[PDB]
Amino acid sequence: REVISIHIGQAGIQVGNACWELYCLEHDAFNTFFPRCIFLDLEPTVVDEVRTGTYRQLFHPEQLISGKEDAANNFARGHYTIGKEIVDLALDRIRKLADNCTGLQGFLVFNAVGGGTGSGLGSLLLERLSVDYGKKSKLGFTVYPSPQVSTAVVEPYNSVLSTHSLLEHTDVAVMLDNEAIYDICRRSLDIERPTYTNLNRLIAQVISSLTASLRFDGALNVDITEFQTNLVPYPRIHFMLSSYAPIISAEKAYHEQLSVAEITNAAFEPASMMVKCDPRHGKYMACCLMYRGDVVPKDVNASVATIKTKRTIQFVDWCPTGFKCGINYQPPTVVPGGDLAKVQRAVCMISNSTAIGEIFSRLDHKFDLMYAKRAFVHWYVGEGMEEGEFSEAREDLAALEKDFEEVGA
Amino acid sequence: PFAQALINRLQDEGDMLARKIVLEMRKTKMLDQQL
Amino acid sequence: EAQQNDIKALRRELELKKAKLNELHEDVRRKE
Amino acid sequence: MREIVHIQGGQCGNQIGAKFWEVVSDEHGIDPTGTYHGDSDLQLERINVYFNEATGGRYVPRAILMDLEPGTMDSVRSGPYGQIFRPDNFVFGQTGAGNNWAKGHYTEGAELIDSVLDVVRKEAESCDCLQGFQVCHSLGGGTGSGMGTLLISKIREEYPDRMMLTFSVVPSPKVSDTVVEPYNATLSVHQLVENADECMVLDNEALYDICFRTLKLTTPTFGDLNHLISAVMSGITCCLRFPGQLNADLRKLAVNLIPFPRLHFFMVGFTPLTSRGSQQYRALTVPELTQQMWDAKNMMCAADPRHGRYLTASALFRGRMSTKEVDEQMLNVQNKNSSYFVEWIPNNVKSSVCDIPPKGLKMSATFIGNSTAIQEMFKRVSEQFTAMFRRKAFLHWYTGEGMDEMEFTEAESNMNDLVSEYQQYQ
Amino acid sequence: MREIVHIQGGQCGNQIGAKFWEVVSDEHGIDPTGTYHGDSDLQLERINVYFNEATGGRYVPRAILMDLEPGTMDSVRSGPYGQIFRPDNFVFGQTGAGNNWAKGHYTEGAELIDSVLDVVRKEAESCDCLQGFQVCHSLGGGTGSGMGTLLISKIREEYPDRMMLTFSVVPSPKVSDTVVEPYNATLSVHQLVENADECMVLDNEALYDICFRTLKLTTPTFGDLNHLISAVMSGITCCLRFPGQLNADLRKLAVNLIPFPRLHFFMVGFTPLTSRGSQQYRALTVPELTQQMWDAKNMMCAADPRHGRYLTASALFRGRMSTKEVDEQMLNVQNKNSSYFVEWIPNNVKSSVCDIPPKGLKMSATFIGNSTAIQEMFKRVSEQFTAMFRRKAFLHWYTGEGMDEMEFTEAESNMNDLVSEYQQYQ
Ligand SMILES: Nc1nc2c(ncn2[C@@H]2O[C@H](COP(=O)(O)OP(=O)(O)OP(=O)(O)O)[C@@H](O)[C@H]2O)c(=O)[nH]1
Ligand SMILES: Nc1nc2c(ncn2[C@@H]2O[C@H](COP(=O)(O)OP(=O)(O)O)[C@@H](O)[C@H]2O)c(=O)[nH]1
Ligand SMILES: Nc1nc2c(ncn2[C@@H]2O[C@H](COP(=O)(O)OP(=O)(O)O)[C@@H](O)[C@H]2O)c(=O)[nH]1
Ligand SMILES: [Mg+2]
């Protein structure tokens, strides 16, 4: 059993540069990863940093795909003009990666929707993967732009135009912001001046905690097909809040008494979500709890009972059994230079609720304001688009808002 | 010459800004009761 | 020369008023 | 990979470019004799963006000097970093225009523009993936403005997809060297609005004012002013030459700062800029760089941005810094000074971080604000232009060369409709 | 965290502040270069209150020098610890007021005070949590009194919820350096009673008396007077910089010593202050500090408190001491001389101890008493003001600048009702 990982863009392969560092440091159990990867980007600067880095010999030279020139924060450019010449080479490699494989669980894609490469050719890669395989799962861990913290200007245009394909192509989509992670590193990790490297290190922790069930034998294992049923009650509602516990420094960890009861609680407070949204406004549709390390089924069982009996958070009226647990034996590993201390046990929670319906509504106004005056539209239209797909992507998010409001009732 | 028109533009703009400043003072004074 | 003084006085007043307006806007955002 | 061909025109262009190639050659560690002598590995892998390996480690710049008077060429060849250019690239007329835009655009350009195009073509296809061209000229002179402007139009006809940067200085009445400044600048802008991709506006008032107030220089010759302009140009294309935590090429900045195709005139600033006596009395943090960036008395144009609103803004950072501090600082200035920014555009600030500082510094920054205060100069110019043209001063020096009255009226028309669209979007 | 921005005005302010920054920097172990060279880790914990780290151990003082003649600015940069101030904090006019309060408050202030305000804003926003501002100036001169008082009024309407100390020497007939001293003192005090949170009265007469008897100095230049004043300022704000068994901050002192919003004029003394001939014969215990503290011939004003009544009093102790001894000594001096204290307030003395002595001594103390005898100065000054103003002496230098006659009558009324209102609570 193996699962291969695709990384797109400046954000994608930097996340991968930390994720693969953790995989090699963690390791027959290796068979699911050893790498079965592909980096691809339009700007050669970040890929060729890997080609000369410490992991020169680790990656086969062909694997590291690199175009000639960047899409430059332009969804249309990275989806219609420049994507068309590189995407064919990428997926015609990924095929022979799958032919190397025999028991493919799925693919997992890493991209940020704000940019052009992460968004544009992300969706383009996804569309040819869906028509080629269809049944095989493709987990997409995307990075959406934050409400108030922002680096680009045209990112609302990109985020809406990317989402229109992220609905019906990916199977399980995990949101991740930058402000929420910045807040996590500021609050729990007490790092007052964080950079992208620290963000990517703890993103890898989440990925590792949800594939450790395939790699190592636990008391209750869970495959990628399991998330497919247990968390998405409707074919078009797959957008997951993420959380992790205990995110804790090296000194505080020894002082505190980490156990199963309190980390099940800590994984539920909005002070520890990976996406800037308040689930107090929403109702939980389903929850999924990956437990790693020193876990007996009793205290995880007792912990979900206390959550259900609390009234600070509510569930939908549909699910009395609104949980999916999972226990694995091997504890989480640490990276030298990393900030997370060694813990006997950790919890990665992936939920689904209606709080996500707020982020789309928040997104709508920013896109709406700019589009009404036709700001920046001339860049995308001359690239090959029209006014049709702007308006039609707009009404797709309008439908999604009504959808969440209907299901939440 | 052209400064005569500049004084008109600057005078009218300053007066309109006072109207915006006035309305905003009522807004903050309205929220302070609700708090 | 007179009209020049009028220009350099109206802009300074305009500038002070714009700064006050920003303060009021900031307070509304924090209070909301 | 990505390639930048350099083109310099006129006296202003040649001397600005001379200081430019001095600082770039030092950044890549190339000696005045043309051979590599740097220390870090990082300085080798991205010199093809600016140089060509000839033979025996001879790295010659990819530049084209262009003028009509030999004084500038000989002064270029005389000084250091003068023996690094290929003598075939010194394309050079002989008669001279002399502050007559008509000479540099219809009569004398007609016999030089053929030779420059031959050199720039052979120099363009020599490299594989062109990123764009980079022009440095003026708008007051004749052989800089007129010939350089005509070269811009011909280049955009041949290569319509490739990028185009223009560092152009504009005349101001407080520093007025020639008498026919309005006649030249107005006609030059008429061609810039339709031909260039983006124009980073400069001026001598702000440059002299900057060296007085902030730098506190005593005798600011053209060397120091050209040194400042070169530091801006190195900062704008540091992303191609060095790896960073967030990259932003030329096209990336262009699409994030230009909301409408005719709105492509920028203001520029460089930080940090401190006096030599106070260089050790300061920290080097991101907030300090931001306070010096958003100061209105720090733009390198004589147009106060607080006289209007910013449409967009850009900040290219260099150095080991935390991206969170970058975004928090940009958000902070976006909330406190809410009236100076446009409302129907949230996020008026694009940011980027490169990992290699300029030589000698720890952390630097470059600001490019596309504001609506730039329209004051166009009005500040058009009022002078009408003052002459109401009464046909100096007009015959251009009329007997080919321009008719419709050309000047067209230049007034384009200037007037432009200032209305900046006023519209404010 | 708790922070004090320092402001020095006029010639009097500049020498006082100069000797002050030497004393504090020497306490924190910073050499004239401005780099850290101390040993104890305790000295580094609380340098955010007065300094900013620049780079490589360089600590810059959080002070602003403000004057009108460059003689004082150059005399500051010449002396030791002169190279530590940031040269941009030397905000500075050029013409000179010259002992004319109207010139200091209406003509030259109107173009310098915007500049000094802008520096203060940067210095206030550069830090996080303001504790207060600290202004040192005189009341006889013009560039200190009128400009400094305008600065006080402008700042108080900007940050109204923060404390503010002002240390002001006041004129007296026995030390009469200028001729218009009362015309300056009366108008300055009128503004201080309505703007400043608390004032600390000083005078040059008492300082000369201290240097004669207690110090027994041969040649008391201004350096020694500024030395005494600096020791007082360091002593009062020692609590924020060092931990102790009973800490008392500036706001804690203000609310404990000011019973009514207009009664905020204090007389200050410092101990131990002994000559080198008798410093060898002395002992260091709490009673010897108190009976030298509460001596009338040790106050730094020419207002003998036994000619009035004490409202409240305060003592700030420094050094490893026993708090029982501190409290019983305050109890003894209040029970014996019960008549000198106010009757409707028991336990008139606020006391505090800090565990870091100044360098060169083992144990020290600092006394701040809010008596009612301060009215001797108000009557003593107002009669000289009346003696000239009944006859319109020197008036035209004030009148011809913008001031009219009702300003003097209003100032007379407010000073006169103030001494009347001190007398009623007496
Ligand atoms: N978590 C995380 N996010 C990143 C990182 N680098 C970039 N991003 C995000 O990526 C978004 C912009 O896209 P980029 O990845 O930088 O660039 P791109 O997706 O390759 O698109 P192009 O610039 O056209 O090449 C920004 O909003 C960032 O939030 C990173 O290292 N870690
Ligand atoms: N910054 C800078 N400006 C210059 C320099 N030389 C000329 N200028 C400006 O250029 C304008 C005149 O341009 P000119 O040299 O006549 O252009 P040309 O005749 O077409 O080559 C004047 O306003 C000068 O201020 C220089 O070396 N540096
Ligand atoms: N303690 C002290 N007082 C001073 C010093 N220099 C001047 N003075 C006092 O300042 C008063 C005159 O004020 P002046 O210096 O002219 O104030 P300015 O002109 O406003 O700056 C005199 O009464 C002096 O006692 C000094 O070095 N120490
Ligand atoms: Mg990118």
3-class SS letters over chain C: CHHHHHHHHHHHHHHHHHHHHHHHHHHHHHHC
The answer to whether residues D398 and D183 touch, using CB atoms and an 8 Å cutoff, is yes
Instruction: Provide the H-helix boundaries in E126-249.
Output: 145-156, 181-195, 204-213, 222-236, 238-241
Q: Is D418 exposed, middle or buried (0-12, 13-18, 19+ CB in 10 A)?
A: buried
Under DSSP, the state recorded for E257 is: H
Beta bridge partner(s), residue A237: A234
The answer to whether residues D305 and D369 touch, using CB atoms and an 8 Å cutoff, is yes
Please list, residue by residue across E19-47, b when 16 or more beta carbons sit within 10 angstroms of its beta carbon and e when fewer do. bbbbbbbbbbbbbeebebeeeeeebeebb
Angle between helices A179-187 and A196-215 (to 10 degrees): 90
E417 vs E426: CA distance, rounded Å: 14
A98 vs A107: CA distance, rounded Å: 9
Instruction: Provide the H-helix boundaries in D96-237.
Output: 101-102, 109-124, 145-158, 181-195, 204-213, 222-236
Which residues from D are below 8 Å from E60, CB to CB? 281
Positive or negative: CA dihedral C13, C18, C22, C27:
positive
Q: What is the edge-to-edge ordering of all strands in the sheet holding A172-174?
A: A37-40, A4-8, A106-112, A137-143, A172-174
Instruction: Provide the H-helix boundaries in A240-386.
Output: 250-255, 260-266, 297-309, 356-372, 377-383
Residues 6+ apart with CB under 8 A from C8: none
Q: What is the CB-side half-sphere exposure of residue A55 using CA atoms within 13 A? A: 20
**A195 alpha carbon to ligand 1 midpoint, in Å?**
13
Which atom of ligand 2 is least distant from the CA of D144?
Answer: 20
E-assigned strands of A57-156? 106-112, 137-143
Q: What is the edge-to-edge ordering of all strands in the sheet holding D198-202?
A: D90-92, D63-67, D2-9, D129-138, D163-169, D198-202, D265-271, D364-371, D310-318, D349-354
- Tokens representing residue A68 in the block: 């000639």
The answer to whether residues D378 and D419 touch, using CB atoms and an 8 Å cutoff, is yes
Angle between helices E145-156 and E10-27 (to 10 degrees): 70
Angle at D25 between CA D115 and CA D73, to 5 degrees: 35
Best residue in D255, D328, D353, D425 for a mutation probing chain A (most A CBs within 10 Å): D255
Which run of H or of E encompasses E400?
none
Tell me whether residue D83 is annotated as binding.
Answer: no
Query: Resolution in angstroms, to 1 decimal, for this deposition?
Result: 3.3
Examine the residue annotation and report whether A168 is marked as an active-site residue of this protein: no
- Give me the catalytic one of A226, A262, A269, A389: A226
A329 vs A345: CA distance, rounded Å: 9
| C-beta contacts of D21-28 below 8 A and 24+ residues apart | D21/D61, D21/D63, D21/D81, D21/D84, D22/D80, D22/D81, D22/D230, D23/D227, D23/D230, D23/D231, D23/D234, D24/D50, D24/D61, D24/D234, D25/D61, D25/D81, D25/D84, D26/D359, D27/D234, D27/D241, D27/D358, D27/D359, D28/D59
Which atom of ligand 2 is least distant from the CA of D229?
Answer: 1
| C-beta contacts of E329-337 below 8 A and 24+ residues apart | E329/E286, E329/E287, E329/E290, E330/E290, E332/E290, E333/E290, E333/E291, E333/E294
Cα–Cα distances (Å) from D381 to D171, D178, D198, D230, D378, in that order, read 9, 14, 20, 26, 5
Q: Measuring CA to CA, which residue among E18, E51, E86 is closest to residue D280?
A: E86
The answer to whether residues A30 and A22 touch, using CB atoms and an 8 Å cutoff, is no
**D14 touches ligand 2 (CB under 6 Å):** no
Which residues from C are below 8 Å from B27, CB to CB? 24, 28
For residue D77, the Cα-to-chain-centroid distance in whole angstroms is 23
Please, which experimental method was used? Answer: cryo-EM
E206 vs E43: CA distance, rounded Å: 33
D86 vs E311: CA distance, rounded Å: 89
- The verdict on D280 touching E (C-beta cutoff 8 Å) is yes
Which atom of ligand 2 is least distant from the CA of D225?
Answer: 1
Q: Do C14 and B10 touch (CB under 8 A)?
A: yes
E106 vs E187: CA distance, rounded Å: 13
Q: Is E270 left (phi over 0), alpha (psi -120 to 50) or beta?
A: beta
A101 vs A3: CA distance, rounded Å: 9
Compute the residue count for chain E: 426
Candidate of D8, D11, D187 to mutate for ligand 2, largest count of ligand atoms within 8 Å of Cβ = D11
Beta bridge partner(s), residue A112: A143
Instruction: Provide the H-helix boundaries in D237-322.
Output: 238-241, 250-257, 286-293
Of C11, C15, C25, the CB nearest to D338: C25
A260 vs A266: CA distance, rounded Å: 10
- Tokens representing residue A395 in the block: 């009404």
E94 vs E115: CA distance, rounded Å: 13
Query: Residue with structure tokens 């009514």?
Result: E260
Instruction: Provide the H-helix boundaries in D322-404.
Output: 323-336, 375-389, 396-399
The answer to whether residues D185 and D171 touch, using CB atoms and an 8 Å cutoff, is yes
Q: What is the DSSP string of E283-339?
A: ---HHHHHHHHS-GGG-SSS--GGGS-EEEEEEEEESS--HHHHHHHHHHHHHHTGG
A246 vs E270: CA distance, rounded Å: 55
**A117 touches ligand 1 (CB under 6 Å):** yes
Q: Do C26 and D340 touch (CB under 8 A)?
A: no
Q: What is the CB-side half-sphere exposure of residue A314 using CA atoms within 13 A? A: 11
Q: Measuring CA to CA, which residue among A9, A75, A4 is closest to residue A39?
A: A9
Query: Residue with structure tokens 């040192």?
Result: E136
How many other C-beta atoms lie within 10 A of the C-beta of residue A25?
12
Which residues from B are below 8 Å from C4, CB to CB? 3
Q: How much of chain B is in helix, strand and coil states, percent to nearest 5? A: 90, 0, 10
The CA-to-CA distance between both ends of chain B, in Å, stands at: 53
For residue E376, the Cα-to-chain-centroid distance in whole angstroms is 19
The answer to whether residues A177 and D375 touch, using CB atoms and an 8 Å cutoff, is no
E34 vs D343: CA distance, rounded Å: 46
In single-letter form, the type of residue at position E258 comes to I
Best residue in E30, E33, E59, E88 for a mutation probing chain D (most D CBs within 10 Å): E88
Which run of H or of E encompasses A205?
helix A196-215
Beta bridge partner(s), residue E36: E30
Breaks (C-N over 2.5 A) in chain B follow: none
For residue D78, the Cα-to-chain-centroid distance in whole angstroms is 25
How far C12 CA lies from chain B's nearest CA (Å)?
A: 10
A78 vs A123: CA distance, rounded Å: 10
The answer to whether residues A157 and A190 touch, using CB atoms and an 8 Å cutoff, is no
Of B13, B14, B25, the CB nearest to C24: B25
A58 vs A78: CA distance, rounded Å: 29
Q: Do D247 and A193 touch (CB under 8 A)?
A: no
A189 vs A173: CA distance, rounded Å: 26
Q: Measuring CA to CA, which residue among D196, D51, D76 is closest to residue D134?
A: D196
Residues 6+ apart with CB under 8 A from A25: A333, A335
Asked if residue D32 has a cis previous peptide bond (ω within 30° of 0), the answer is: no
D116 vs D124: CA distance, rounded Å: 12
Which run of H or of E encompasses E414?
helix E405-425
Which run of H or of E encompasses A44?
helix A44-52
- Tokens representing residue D391 in the block: 């009464």
E341 vs A117: CA distance, rounded Å: 81
Phi, psi of D282 (to 5 degrees): -135, 155
Cα–Cα distances (Å) from A342 to A22, A38, A251, in that order, read 14, 30, 11
Which atom of ligand 1 is least distant from the CA of A199?
Answer: 1
Asked if residue E272 has a cis previous peptide bond (ω within 30° of 0), the answer is: yes
Beta bridge partner(s), residue A206: none
Phi, psi of D53 (to 5 degrees): -75, 120
Asked if residue A246 has a cis previous peptide bond (ω within 30° of 0), the answer is: yes
- Tokens representing residue E189 in the block: 């005090």
The answer to whether residues A11 and A111 touch, using CB atoms and an 8 Å cutoff, is yes
D379 vs A157: CA distance, rounded Å: 34
- Tokens representing residue D92 in the block: 């050079």
How far C7 CA lies from chain B's nearest CA (Å)?
A: 6
Residues 6+ apart with CB under 8 A from E176: none
**B24 alpha carbon to ligand 4 midpoint, in Å?**
41
Positive or negative: CA dihedral E245, E250, E253, E255:
negative
Q: How many helices (H) and strands (E) does chain D have?
A: 15, 12
The answer to whether residues A293 and A287 touch, using CB atoms and an 8 Å cutoff, is no
How many other C-beta atoms lie within 10 A of the C-beta of residue A116?
30
- The protein residues having their C-beta less than 5 angstroms from ligand 4 (an ion) are A 10, 115
Please list, residue by residue across E170-187, b when 16 or more beta carbons sit within 10 angstroms of its beta carbon and e when fewer do. bbbeebeeeebbbbbbbb
The answer to whether residues E294 and E306 touch, using CB atoms and an 8 Å cutoff, is no
Give Dmax over CA atoms of chain D in angstroms.
Answer: 63
Q: What residue of D is the nearest CA neighbor of E61? A: D281
E385 vs E376: CA distance, rounded Å: 14
Q: Measuring CA to CA, which residue among D47, D252, D237, D352 is closest to residue A42?
A: D252
Whose atoms come closest to the Cα of D168: which ligand?
Answer: 2
How many other C-beta atoms lie within 10 A of the C-beta of residue D158?
11
Phi, psi of D349 (to 5 degrees): -130, 115
Residues 6+ apart with CB under 8 A from E134: E4, E5, E6, E7, E164, E165, E166, E167, E233, E237
Beta bridge partner(s), residue D138: D169
- Tokens representing residue A348 in the block: 């990665």
Q: Does E have 3 or more CB contacts under 8 Å with B?
A: no
How far C25 CA lies from chain B's nearest CA (Å)?
A: 7
